[PDB]
Symmetry: D3
């Protein structure tokens, strides 16, 4: 009866989340049962459509992590349908302006704070009759910062009330700056921008997150004060693990 | 226009294969593009049903590994439908007797060698008009040895003409012997049985395979002369990788 | 070869429709065979995506009710794809302005009345070669009135030619007015607004519908003159029925 | 970390279960959250295949009822795959002989008690490292008694160690006796047979269950001492509820 | 309220049926609306599993042809589940003996004529309360004759009461005789065997069918007196049509 | 490691493509293996949703044609998700203005040429580490011209840099001009408009395509100089083929 990520924050610690680009419920449950506070399902850069995401949300909740979705787009009705299917965290890509951030916020709250349409099929099952009064608190929302334009507008994005803060997409950000879209990059301009976004988010009293490609980079980000750190995509972890098993198997 | 595992064998080397318990095409293609000769899809201990296996076979072939299936059961019509969907390797569980091995063989060959029903939807697309004449060679079949009874009958199982040999299921085998179902076990009685099956398979001029849970164990099995070595299940590799990313991320 | 709801209207009676939030074809057909003129599939507050709605439309038609969809959003291309999949009634949520009502109308008619794209896969199978000439009549469209803003703009919404009228979403409407989102509410301000919308719809010579949560409320709405009354959601009816079976079973 | 039905029994009370013929997770979770100890998914007389049952098992567990399956057939490998997908109760239809009952039992226990193949994908996630030692206790198995032949062999069926008892299929039983296949029948010969099966099951110290079509009949069966009572199918409850809503809506 | 194929027969004409190896509802409905009396869905040599066949049965019925299935195997519980999903014709492959023909018949009739389990989800919706009394007549069953063994046993297969007759699988039959598995073959031994099966079926007062690969061959078979003629597989027709469109498009 | 359609163009010949309105992988692979340079999957006038398109892209690539999609709408995030699923050609419907053409172009190129978001799940598997540098060349984009408005704006649409040119939708175009939406029409005004669009596309040094309903019409279009010609929809070809098989079968 609490959003596990909001509970981390309220208790003075950051949240660590998984990141899924592969459809299906078995690995979603298995990863959720690990020491992840949340598991994010990626609906942008994956083959995961709505019909596949819906059972995954159930599986993550059963496993004991908060189900989050990184949506394909910042679209209010898409977001609302995920909320009603038991997505309790929403990370919306490519939020570049205050207005777009206000569109995200509008989907996450009922009237009068937002315009979320009422029909909370799965949240009502989870939270019971008192859901409406606590509904906003049950959902975490983060706007993604992934372009030079979003960088330019970061303080104004951060001034939007109905979102908890921002989530950096560092490979898109690197690419828009003219650099290779390398995860966990050391490119100075990208590193500088990432720090700046974190500094501005905290100056505004908001939360800041970042997508990580390794456990070591994630540790550093937590030490730097990021409130929400993901590490690492299921497909990338599995590929790397398989490459290593093959190398070990085929070694002389 | 050749079965990649049979090509390994014909060229004097063993085959290394992947092992999938998670449904979906993206990781299947990605793992197939690694230095695996085959990728086995597990339809026994997984949620993978026929509707999910069918696109995975396509994805593995595109990725450049031979698509194999470990079936739910040694059932001829199930096996035939997979063959016609472009499974080119069949590993049938719990083959305990010569008769059961003859049932497996019967599904893998057309008349007069077997009773496979004719309608090769995807093999005909892959191999063209000459498929019928080469059809038996396009498919690898292995009977699984997983019980004390299968151990007792190993020479008779190995005497069946229409299968390439046997595939050891070492966790089931350990359990039937009264030991913990540990993968890559060191339990002497299980290790002894595994060696014995390999020795008998080669004494019969047949192929022998084994399921491995790690790259190091797989290396040893290849050195011991196993012809077909799988390593390691996608779900197990992904779980272990995630546990390590989390440990690294949360370390002080 | 007629839209069953339009036939009710043309013959001087209202239409009673079912309302489905559960995916699947078996209950859709079974409910369609009851004395429902239409069955509405809810794609907003449900886990029903396009891949699941498509066979349900077939099942409702076979069962003998007109297949309707309440869409996730008032989006023209989404609506057109449903029309071509054999949705013959469209209820679009959250239609708040004349312009948004004109967007809905544009999707429901071919040129020159609208901009519906031509490729009527299933309507052409149902209606044959004469489909094009009668296509507009084969589809019912209703704009949903669910906010204070939609209330403010009701006469202008009702002035849009290409829609048959409006469909009240009374739980959203109650919530936007600051009241509990109770179905079949007695809250005076909400009841007053609902009556007003009905009065304005009929003053404009248009049709008016309303979502009901019970058979008794639905009877009253029909008596008040609503032209299209839904009652009641499959999930709500099933839950209530199960609660009662359990109470009866566990009673002393 | 306990099978909820076995816990009822161990604590001196019967279990009441739901019964689902409609695929999908939303109603499965919603019904599971009611005061049902278990929810049975019917894979015999429904369109529910393996790909649809798998997420339903997850949803029922999350909702707080024990997930059960009435299988299509008493087939060991089918049953094992459901066990590994997190079915914790198995009701097998048309168990007519001691041998068939022994086949059911063989699938539900690992060696040496049975021949269940080892790869417990979801039970291991639920129960953790100690699963193997408690695995038999985590699963309930019931053989269905549905024919004159099963009646003739009831004591011998009941003598099989590895099943908890029997589950009466009273419409099939009525039909095989030459009577209408009416649920909750009053036909004396069928009523007499049902009582006899219950009496013999308890004389053998085993559990007995029965499929019910109403809450009142279910109450009587619990009073008569049945240990496992289902009531009533989702589709039948929903159909009846819809018929009543329509009758109420269309009444003058 | 009648099986369209049985109506052909009762009215003194043969039945012509379609044959589908491609999953999906759109072409199934479209072909059903043509002058086919039935459409057969092939679950043996196709990727069509149960989850895909179920909506196709609905679509064929809506289109106005009798839905038939050629099953993967002659398995009673598989057949019963299709019957309850609204398959009204069953063609079972590889029926080689009287006993196997008796197994097929047993699945198609309720007690006392057969052992079909009672739960007719979709037939009860189609036929209403009087279904039970007419259930046998609503289903057509044909045993496939596809091997030398089935040829050897043809009179005994034909003596089985509960099946309408036999359906020749001529490519399998050719292959078992040592000839190329060519559809619509002119190979004398195969042609002779096909005629013999027809002659014996009619000498027994039973129905006989045959799979055809072209409209011309199908015409000849109807003229020779076959009672049930299929022509031709959707995939084969579509492939041939596409080849011709390409040849026409690329011609100088 | 090349887009097959771009290779046609670079080598001085047009491309001929298939057109699929039926979901599924088997016919997609089979048609791809014919002498089609590309196969277009229609997501506008079909029941093909994202979950169904994804495996079809894999199947077309394996078959040896370039996978293209005609999307439901010109929506950047929809297009990006298809690109990352291995759509290598995008045909966007109802592109009516320069601005809408610029929206299409923006989705097809990474920064700085466009705003495509980075996460190329399947293109990176196909093209390897050098993908980013060649990514724009791997994708073909065409804007559809289907209205009087698009005709009015054709030169301005053609002036957009990031698209290869335009694709005529001639049935929509005919309908918007007030004529019957006949494929391969002879209506002078429509024929004149089609020629004009081709002439303007080539005057701008861009590519022009057209949807054809027959091989003969397609031949003429290639002779007239169209660079990308589709012929003909799978459903239309299959329907016509079945009608002819039935006519031949039922002829005296
Ligand atoms: O739309 C209204 C609610 O979602 C019905 O449950
Ligand atoms: O459960 C949902 C809300 O609390 C009802 O108003
Ligand atoms: O069954 C015969 C063949 O499979 C038809 O293609
Ligand atoms: O392609 C299949 C076989 O070769 C035809 O006989
Ligand atoms: O787009 C054109 C039509 O839909 C083709 O059937
Ligand atoms: O069927 C569709 C239309 O009537 C053809 O113009
Ligand atoms: O078959 C062996 C086990 O299931 C692998 O996880
Ligand atoms: O989790 C499964 C078993 O307990 C491992 O032996
Ligand atoms: O099994 C009994 C019947 O199918 C319940 O509807
Ligand atoms: O509908 C099914 C049967 O007729 C009921 O006995
Ligand atoms: O979003 C970032 C990338 O897609 C992660 O793989
Ligand atoms: O594979 C994708 C790109 O080339 C990495 O930058
Ligand atoms: Br952990
Ligand atoms: Br699902
Ligand atoms: Br990464
Ligand atoms: Br590698
Ligand atoms: Br598929
Ligand atoms: Br392992
Ligand atoms: Br009724
Ligand atoms: Br479907
Ligand atoms: Br309600
Ligand atoms: Br309750
Ligand atoms: Br699932
Ligand atoms: Br019932
Ligand atoms: Br026709
Ligand atoms: Br379905
Ligand atoms: Br053929
Ligand atoms: Br060709
Ligand atoms: Br897929
Ligand atoms: Br066409
Ligand atoms: K956790
Ligand atoms: K490989
Ligand atoms: K009706
Ligand atoms: K419960
Ligand atoms: K017909
Ligand atoms: K090709
Ligand atoms: Mg990004
Ligand atoms: Mg095993
Ligand atoms: Mg609403
Ligand atoms: Mg029964
Ligand atoms: Mg055959
Ligand atoms: Mg068009």
């Amino acid at each position: 009866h609490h959003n596990k990520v909001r509970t981390c924050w309220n208790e003075g610690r950051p949240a660590l989340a998984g990141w899924l680009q592969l459809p299906g419920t078995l690995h979603a449950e298995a990863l959720a049962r690990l020491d992840y506070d949340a598991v994010v399902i990626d609906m942008q850069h994956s083959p995961i459509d709505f019909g596949q995401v819906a059972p995954m949300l159930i599986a993550i909740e059963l496993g004991g992590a908060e189900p989050f979705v990184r949506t394909q787009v910042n679209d209010p009705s898409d977001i609302m349908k995920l909320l009603d299917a038991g997505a309790y965290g929403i990370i919306a890509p490519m939020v570049n302006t205050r207005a777009e951030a206000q569109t995200l916020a509008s989907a996450l709250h009922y009237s009068p704070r937002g315009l979320r349409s009422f029909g909370p099929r799965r949240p009502s099952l989870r939270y019971g009759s008192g859901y409406l009064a606590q509904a906003s608190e049950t959902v975490v929302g983060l706007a993604m910062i992934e372009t030079r334009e979003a960088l330019a507008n970061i303080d104004e994005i951060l001034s939007v009330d109905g979102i908890d803060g921002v989530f950096i997409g560092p490979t898109d950000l690197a690419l828009d700056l003219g650099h290779a879209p390398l995860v966990d990059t050391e490119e100075a301009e990208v590193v500088s921008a990432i720090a700046h976004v974190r500094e501005r988010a905290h100056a505004a009293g908001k939360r800041v997150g970042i997508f990580c490609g390794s456990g070591g980079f994630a540790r550093v980000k937590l030490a730097e004060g990021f409130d929400f750190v993901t590490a690492a995509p299921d497909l990338a972890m599995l590929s790397a693990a398989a490459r290593q098993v093959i190398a070990d198997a085929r070694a002389l």
